[PDB]
Design a protein. Structure first.
Length: 41
């Protein structure tokens, strides 16, 4: 949940979007990207 990029822009087209971290989710909002968010939070 408390991942390095909470509310930080990710992109599912990246390499590790909110991936190998202390639990994080890449919410793919916008057109091509998204944000590392709190899982189900």
């Amino acid at each position: 949940a408390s991942c390095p990029n909470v509310g930080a822009v990710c992109s599912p087209f990246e390499t590790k979007p909110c991936g190998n971290v202390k639990d994080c989710r890449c919410l793919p909002w916008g057109l091509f990207f998204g944000t590392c968010i709190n899982p189900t939070g």
